[PDB]
Design a protein around this ligand. Structure first.
Ligand SMILES: [Zn+2]
Lengths: 76, 95, 103, 94, 76, 184
DNA sequence: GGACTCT
DNA sequence: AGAGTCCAGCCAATGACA
RNA sequence: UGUCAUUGG
């Protein structure tokens, strides 16, 4: 609540950088309209935005990106 | 991964859906060719990216388009990354 | 001194927890379940006569696990982490898998 | 505390997935020969088929769905889910 | 117009294609998704898979692998 | 400015004197055990004499109202007039009237803070680096029009990070950092 | 019924 | 100082009715 | 396909 320069309540998003899908999932009916007015371009890094686009959240095992090293398969 | 597989649509209900990177809506297959009608009427030929989202996500985006809000998705053309070997690290204390 | 802090944080990157080893095991198990080639030594038909979790753990301790995890801007194999941490978490995972009758 | 008892109507209705690969192709062929397979998903044609003899070719990536067996992890819970110990995942017992 | 460059082509492999027949599947994927197709003005005619440089790490998605293959690309 | 809200300002000016003799000191109410004030109150200018106990160094502050400012430097002066303004203004010597309604330095809610030197600032900036490329974490924010930033002010040392020593019921003291952002 | 905002 | 606007736990189960 | 009534944890 005191992560910005002023105490912020649990009802609104005033200073914290919250995405439009986070504000719409929290409950704000004019969130996408205000994002369309101000032409907002937001990255998808939160749970409410990851569940919309069927992305794995950045929580727990989804905190890391996983690759496969095809070197040992191509070597033999 | 558990909550991802729960909240997303079933693996049996999969179909190749393409989205337009310029205007944001679902591409169409006219007679085998993935086209965007809005951009072929506007004399463009933009990128079409395959997406794997839920059907309710597409219904929500199309209804927000019907309200007038254009929703345009951008995709990660990530630079190709290479695994390099790392040195040995021992985290045991020294007594 | 900023180089010293960067070295300390690069040494801190080698810590492994249950989330990282569970994600590595889940990625390799999902890839092996859909038909990827098991990258174990002594490849035979007998290796397709045992269960797949034994193959995953053998790939982990043999150093031939194909999964690379991106953590703190670095790319780590499962053998780039602390060996005692990998052993500490795999002992617990093998214990609870033996309670579940799947290992 | 690591287990949960499942009634017979649930495990007679609920199904579990067995993927087709190099490890489980003999078990899937044995379960298809004994009519224990309920569903079959063909991933390359991307379609599900309910088995009520037809022709099914088992490629890696396809799966079958049979009755759910013991020591399978079910995710069970009570409502309201006030904290994370409400929704756990333990092993099915008959 | 028509020229020859050194680029990357990003394709998707299924996990059953990560066998000992892997580069045949990579060649078939590159030839089906990128050969004889117009992608934003440029149109590659015949593509040769460059196989003297390190293969990059394969990024894992929900059920597939996304690899960026280095290639000699003849555009037209 | 009245005869009551000048003693609280005198307690503030002990901390300003401590910062003026050492910019990297830890400021809390315990600093008040090392100083001694003497107040000469008048409705035009109030003279506050802060004396260091062991070093016998004197500093005379001249406290004015915002309207009537008649500032000429006395000997052993601070070098800048202390102005009691009506509202919160930008300036290290301009204290608003709301800051002096109560005794603020002796309170339990008065923080414990330092200005970081270049070594500790470099350590904090390299800790905040996420390791991936040039990306960086941010510290939580704090406005420049705050009594901590007014106390910690030095004329040619820009104050960017303030380290706070929080009270902690289970660990004693906790370390936090705020970043000072600009106003007007 | 009750809290935030514009008037 | 006073009206507008939005907000009021989760998951159920039957029956009647439009 | 939604309302109303009654009930459960
Ligand atoms: Zn278009």
């Amino acid at each position: 609540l005191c992560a910005s320069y002023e105490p912020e309540s649990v009802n609104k998003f005033k200073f914290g950088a919250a995405s439009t899908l986070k504000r719409a999932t929290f409950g704000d009916n004019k969130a996408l309209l205000n994002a369309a007015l101000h032409k907002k371009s937001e990255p998808i890094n939160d749970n409410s935005s990851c569940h919309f686009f069927s992305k794995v959240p950045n929580i727990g095992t989804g905190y890391y990106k996983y690759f496969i090293d095809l070197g040992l398969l191509m070597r033999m | 991964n558990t909550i991802t597989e729960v909240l997303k649509d079933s693996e049996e209900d999969y179909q190749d859906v393409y989205v337009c990177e310029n205007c944001g809506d679902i591409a169409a297959q006219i007679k085998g060719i993935n086209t965007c009608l809005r951009c072929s009427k506007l004399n463009l030929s933009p990128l079409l990216t395959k997406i794997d989202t839920t059907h309710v996500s597409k219904v929500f985006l199309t209804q927000m388009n019907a309200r007038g809000v254009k929703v345009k998705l951008d995709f990660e053309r990530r630079p190709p990354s290479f695994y390099k070997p790392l040195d040995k690290v021992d985290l045991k204390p020294s007594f | 001194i900023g180089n010293h802090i960067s070295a300390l944080k690069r040494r801190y990157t080698r810590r492994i927890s249950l989330f990282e080893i569970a994600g590595i095991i889940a990625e390799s198990y999902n890839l092996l379940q859909r038909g990827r080639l098991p990258l174990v030594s002594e490849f035979s038909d007998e290796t397709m006569k045992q269960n797949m979790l034994h193959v995953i753990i053998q790939e982990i301790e043999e150093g031939s696990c194909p999964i690379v995890i991106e953590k703190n801007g670095e790319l780590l194999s499962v053998n780039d982490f602390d060996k005692d941490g990998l052993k500490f978490h795999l002992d617990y995972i093998i214990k609870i898998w033996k309670l579940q009758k799947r290992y | 505390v690591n287990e949960v008892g499942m009634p017979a109507y649930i495990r007679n209705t609920l199904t579990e997935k067995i993927f087709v690969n190099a490890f489980t192709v003999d078990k899937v062929k044995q379960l298809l020969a004994s009519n224990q397979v309920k569903f079959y998903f063909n991933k390359r044609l991307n379609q599900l088929t309910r088995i009520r003899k037809n022709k099914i070719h088992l490629l890696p990536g396809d799966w079958v769905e049979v009755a759910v067996q013991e020591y399978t992890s079910i995710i069970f819970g009570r409502q309201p889910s006030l904290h994370r110990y409400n929704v756990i995942a333990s092993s099915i017992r008959a | 117009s028509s020229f020859v460059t050194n680029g990357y082509l990003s394709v998707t492999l299924e996990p059953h294609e990560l066998t000992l027949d892997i580069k045949t599947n990579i060649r078939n994927a590159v030839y089906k998704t990128y050969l004889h197709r117009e992608i934003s003005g440029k149109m590659a005619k015949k593509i040769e898979i460059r196989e003297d440089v390190e293969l990059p790490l394969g990024e894992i998605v929900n059920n597939s692998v996304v690899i960026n293959v280095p290639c000699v690309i003849t555009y037209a | 400015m009245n005869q009551y809200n000048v003693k609280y300002l005198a307690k503030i000016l002990c901390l300003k004197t401590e910062i003026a003799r050492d910019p990297y000191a830890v400021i809390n109410r315990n600093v008040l055990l090392r100083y001694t004030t003497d107040i000469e109150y008048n409705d035009l200018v109030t003279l506050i004499t802060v004396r260091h106990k062991i070093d016998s160094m004197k500093t005379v502050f001249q406290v004015f109202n915002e309207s009537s400012i008649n500032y000429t430097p006395v000997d052993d002066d601070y070098g800048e007039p202390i102005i009691i303004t009506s509202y919160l203004q930008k300036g290290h010597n301009k204290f608003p009237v709301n800051f002096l309604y109560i005794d603020v330095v002796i309170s339990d809610l008065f923080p414990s803070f330092v200005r970081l030197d270049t070594t500790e600032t470099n350590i904090v900036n390299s800790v905040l680096q996420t390791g991936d490329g040039k990306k960086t974490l941010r510290l939580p924010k704090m406005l420049e029009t705050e009594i901590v930033v007014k106390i910690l002010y030095r004329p040619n040392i820009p104050l960017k990070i303030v380290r706070f020593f929080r009270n902690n019921m289970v660990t004693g003291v906790e370390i936090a950092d705020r970043s000072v952002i600009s106003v007007a």
